[PDB]
Design a protein around this ligand. Structure first.
Ligand SMILES: CS(=O)(=O)N1CCc2c(c(-c3ccc(Cl)c(C#Cc4ccc(CNCc5ccc(Cl)cc5)cc4)c3)nn2CCCN2CCN(C3CC3)CC2)C1
Length: 219
């Protein structure tokens, strides 16, 4: 029996909204955000993890292209293979591709595995968000309405289920009975509601929010 609303910010599992600047690293921000929640769940500590670590080090071997895009799933695999990821403080974000400068001295988190969810299943995504934690997802953000979003529940008739932007589902609920996913973006505080966007939920995988969900775990 799933709760009617969740918001992982109220459980203290979500770090502040980041600003990716001129670097297509949304995939890296989505991935670290998910792992940040699990790190807090396991250890009690909330620490921002290094998106730049992923940009610089999870590259061609993982199908990732730094500031030209990438995938959260293969980002998690990098963290597994690498046996760690650095804190954001120690490996700060520069919004550009750099040489890999991972240093295990400043390792703030580990990843044992990750799980993908089945394509288009908003019911399964809801369960995972309720029971596991924030979930990394892709959305179709290729529409001016997305970029211009300020408040309310986002609905874009010309959205597709193809995804081109990584974000973090940190919750769900309804606004006056209009169901939504609570989504943490990485375009700073001036995007949406202090960096957050409510996106239509249970409208047939609107903007592909449930097309490619994934979350990591730490044992
Ligand atoms: C079409 S589809 O939706 O059907 N789909 C096709 C199939 C697909 C899509 C996504 C997916 C899921 C989540 C996200 Cl987030 C993304 C993404 C993204 C993205 C794209 C562009 C940008 C950059 N934006 C423009 C920009 C450029 C430069 C700058 Cl500086 C600034 C901005 C950022 C993020 C993709 N997973 N899979 C399935 C897995 C695909 N692989 C992953 C790894 N492989 C290689 C073996 C390594 C095999 C399989 C997309």
């Amino acid at each position: 029996i799933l709760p009617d609303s969740v918001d992982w910010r109220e459980k203290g599992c979500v770090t502040e909204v980041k600003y990716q600047g001129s670097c297509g690293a949304s995939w890296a921000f989505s991935a670290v955000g998910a792992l940040e929640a699990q790190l807090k769940l396991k250890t009690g500590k909330l620490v921002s993890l290094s998106a730049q670590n992923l940009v610089d080090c999870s590259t061609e071997k993982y199908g990732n292209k730094g500031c030209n895009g990438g995938f959260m799933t293969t980002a998690f695999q990098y963290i597994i293979d690498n046996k760690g990821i650095d804190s954001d403080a120690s490996y700060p974000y520069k919004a550009m591709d750099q040489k890999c400068q991972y240093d295990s001295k400043y390792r703030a988190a580990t990843c044992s595995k990750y799980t993908e969810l089945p394509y288009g299943r908003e019911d399964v995504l809801k369960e995972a968000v309720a029971n596991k934690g924030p979930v990394s997802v892709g959305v179709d953000a290729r529409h001016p309405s997305f970029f211009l979003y300020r408040s309310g529940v986002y609905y874009e008739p010309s959205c597709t289920q193809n995804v081109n932007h990584g974000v973090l589902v940190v919750g769900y609920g309804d606004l006056n009975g209009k169901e939504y996913w609570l989504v943490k973006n990485s375009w700073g505080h001036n995007f949406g509601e202090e960096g957050y966007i409510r996106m239509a939920r249970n409208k047939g995988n609107h903007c592909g929010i449930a097309s490619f969900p994934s979350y990591p775990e730490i044992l």
